[PDB]
Amino acid sequence: SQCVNLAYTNSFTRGVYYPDKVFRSSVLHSTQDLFLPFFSNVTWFHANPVLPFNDGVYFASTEKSNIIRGWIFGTTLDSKTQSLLIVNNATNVVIKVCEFQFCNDPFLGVYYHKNNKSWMESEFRVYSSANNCTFEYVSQPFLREFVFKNIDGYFKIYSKSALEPLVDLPIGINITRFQTLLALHRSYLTPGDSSSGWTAGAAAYYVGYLQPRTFLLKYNENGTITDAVD
């Protein structure tokens, strides 16, 4: 194997996405969906814990570098069940569903490759094993805020108020917990360097949870402009 062994709260009126509907409209429209309460208790994390998923999550981060690369979703996060794994390269996004034998403290290891002049990332250090892969999606990579919901076998994603729909995925798997996927690097540059010294800039992310609440969405010509809940 390759695995390595390595709060504050807030509140704001964001976390609005097109209401799981792709219908065009130009007036106010009510909706009973899974939404984020406007002045709810958001948790401010420093990095890294396995967080519950519940019915949805609000995720946002202002991290300057390319340290936060994605997330892992699933139940036991073991080889016993299938899990979701989103990874963002500088050029691509990669979404796979397999039976990942995840590491206790997963991270996307960044290392120097002397024969290519380049830095590269290793999905080892994230999972020691990966079998029974049923789904693989590849396209361009994803303040950066996301909404994740897993309903009717589909995993739906909105990004950027008014979070536009990013993509939704016929995953068809149960998702109860998730963890943020960090990119760590290491280099042999001083005679005393330690191979265990994986490091990166300080990374922090906001996590909220979605609630089943009636909302009102104001459309003018395209994007949702205002919103309302009580």
Epitope: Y112, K114, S187, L189, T190, P191, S194
Partner: antibody, heavy 116, light 109 residues
């Protein structure tokens, strides 16, 4: 382990490097004849992206690497009695963008005796 | 080859310097001078790299400098354990490394 060799034969010394992998490290080889000083045989130049050999040894020394096992090899051929020495592997940086260059010896070397 | 004095001696507590005279092809054109310490029967130990920098663990009594084509290692407060062989090493404009002949260092007893 120590190697005894008749003149004109060849030897292949090994070096198992833990910690960082071989792909993210420059490997050098130095030797020291009994009672004499250190002699640099060859090593990986970060700016060149490949291994450079001392001109005294080009054509007769070959260094290779097994990224699977993380073992560095060096093979000396047509060896004469002047090749009796302790052979040291050494680890150095590989990133050419940094402006550090050096090699740190790895283990306690292997003795290679050539005698008829 | 780089040129070092064959031998150098000093009393405990004193300072000494070992010089490493190269050429424009190595010490004159690059800041890649290393210094190695070798006790009898043991593998050389890196003491200085990049002319002046010391690896973690090496005491601050060891210091390096460069002037023109000449690099120098200086040891302050000679200890009995400092008695060893010292080799300088320099990067060359042929992308190779070269060694000095070695300086035997005696802490006078």
């Amino acid at each position: 382990g120590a190697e005894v060799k008749k003149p004109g034969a060849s030897v292949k010394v090994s070096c198992k490097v833990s910690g960082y992998t071989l792909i993210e490290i420059s490997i050098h080889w130095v030797r020291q004849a009994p009672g004499k000083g250190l002699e640099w045989m060859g090593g990986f130049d970060p700016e060149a992206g490949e291994t450079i050999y001392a001109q005294k040894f080009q054509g007769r020394v070959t260094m290779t690497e097994d990224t699977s096992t993380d073992t560095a090899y060096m093979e000396v051929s047509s060896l004469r009695s002047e090749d009796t020495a302790v052979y040291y592997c050494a680890t150095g940086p590989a990133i050419a963008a940094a402006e550090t260059n050096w090699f740190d010896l790895w283990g306690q070397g292997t003795l290679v005796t050539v005698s008829s | 080859a780089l040129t070092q004095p064959a031998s150098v001696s000093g009393s405990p507590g004193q300072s000494i310097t070992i010089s490493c005279t190269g050429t424009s092809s190595d010490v004159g054109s690059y800041n890649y001078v290393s210094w190695y310490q070798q006790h009898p029967g043991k593998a050389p130990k890196l003491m200085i790299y990049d002319v002046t920098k010391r690896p973690s663990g090496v005491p601050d009594r060891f210091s390096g400098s460069k002037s023109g084509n000449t690099a120098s290692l200086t040891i302050s407060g000679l200890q009995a354990e400092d008695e060893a062989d010292y080799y300088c090493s320099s990067y060359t404009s042929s992308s190779t490394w070269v060694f000095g002949g070695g300086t035997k260092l005696t802490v006078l007893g």
